[PDB]
Amino acid sequence: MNLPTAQEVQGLMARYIELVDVGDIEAIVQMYADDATVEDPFGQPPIHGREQIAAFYRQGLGGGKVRACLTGPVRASHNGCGAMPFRVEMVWNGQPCALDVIDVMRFDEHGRIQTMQAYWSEVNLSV
Amino acid sequence: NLPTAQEVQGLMARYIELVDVGDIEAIVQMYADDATVEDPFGQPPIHGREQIAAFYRQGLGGGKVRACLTGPVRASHNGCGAMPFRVEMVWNGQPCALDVIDVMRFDEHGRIQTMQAYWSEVNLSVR
Numbered sequence A: 001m002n003l004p005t006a007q008e009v010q011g012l013m014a015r016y017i018e019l020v021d022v023g024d025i026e027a028i029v030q031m032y033a034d035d036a037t038v039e040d041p042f043g044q045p046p047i048h049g050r051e052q053i054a055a056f057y058r059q060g061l062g063g064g065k066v067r068a069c070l071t072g073p074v075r076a077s078h079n080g081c082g083a084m085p086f087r088v089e090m091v092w093n094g095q096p097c098a099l100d101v102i103d104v105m106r107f108d109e110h111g112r113i114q115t116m117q118a119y120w121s122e123v124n125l126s127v
Numbered sequence B: 001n002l003p004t005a006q007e008v009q010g011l012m013a014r015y016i017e018l019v020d021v022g023d024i025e026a027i028v029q030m031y032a033d034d035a036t037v038e039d040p041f042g043q044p045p046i047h048g049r050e051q052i053a054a055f056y057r058q059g060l061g062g063g064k065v066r067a068c069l070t071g072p073v074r075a076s077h078n079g080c081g082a083m084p085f086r087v088e089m090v091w092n093g094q095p096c097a098l099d100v101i102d103v104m105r106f107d108e109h110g111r112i113q114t115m116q117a118y119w120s121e122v123n124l125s126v127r
């Protein structure tokens, strides 16, 4: 496909969350442009390219069992960008917990994620 | 006074309350002199306090517009944050709701440097 329409952005970002929930790092990486940037959490040095994005997320969604679900609709623009609210449930000190996140994504003219920012900090972690 | 993550949470929630009340001059006072507003994200940025003032005056011109958070503010440690909320208004003679995510960057004075409002007609619904 091409630069995603607003409806297409909603579908792509919803699919992304489904991939996080099942832990399919390979499929997440293929959603990214080969030269994408990830800032997760926003404020940390950017991660650059599919190899480093794969390595980074195999530390997480491979090491432990994690879940994720949208907590509201995907907001989508007409320039191939969108933003979504979601919640991640995981193990914290041998104790389940919840993290509230918003990802902002910009897609390229091939329908792949060019940039992603994940807004969250410990203020968004609850036990 | 580069807002901490907890201070960003308070600043962004305070902004939604000012929108809900509709105090346009109180809203504009939150922005820095050289701030930009992109709303909806994808449209050319607005800059200059009075242009920002006129923009809010046209949207909240009374004009029964309501706004409320629909999730917690996500906040970073570099003075930025993102929040999901819901706008209630009347359009086409129909009571409507609009789901939005705002992304904001604050300056070292605690004032809004950049605002980006993610939404489009895919986020419109009748109530």
Ligand SMILES: C[C@]12CC[C@H]3[C@@H](CCC4=CC(=O)CC[C@@H]43)[C@@H]1CC[C@@H]2O
Pocket (backbone or CB within 6 Å): B019, B039, B058, B059, B060, B065, B087, B089, B098, B100, B102, B117, B119
């Ligand atoms: C202008 C408007 C009311 C104010 C909203 C705007 C959507 C974006 C938004 C985001 C803010 O941060 C301020 C309030 C406006 C609506 C789109 C249509 C509606 O009338």
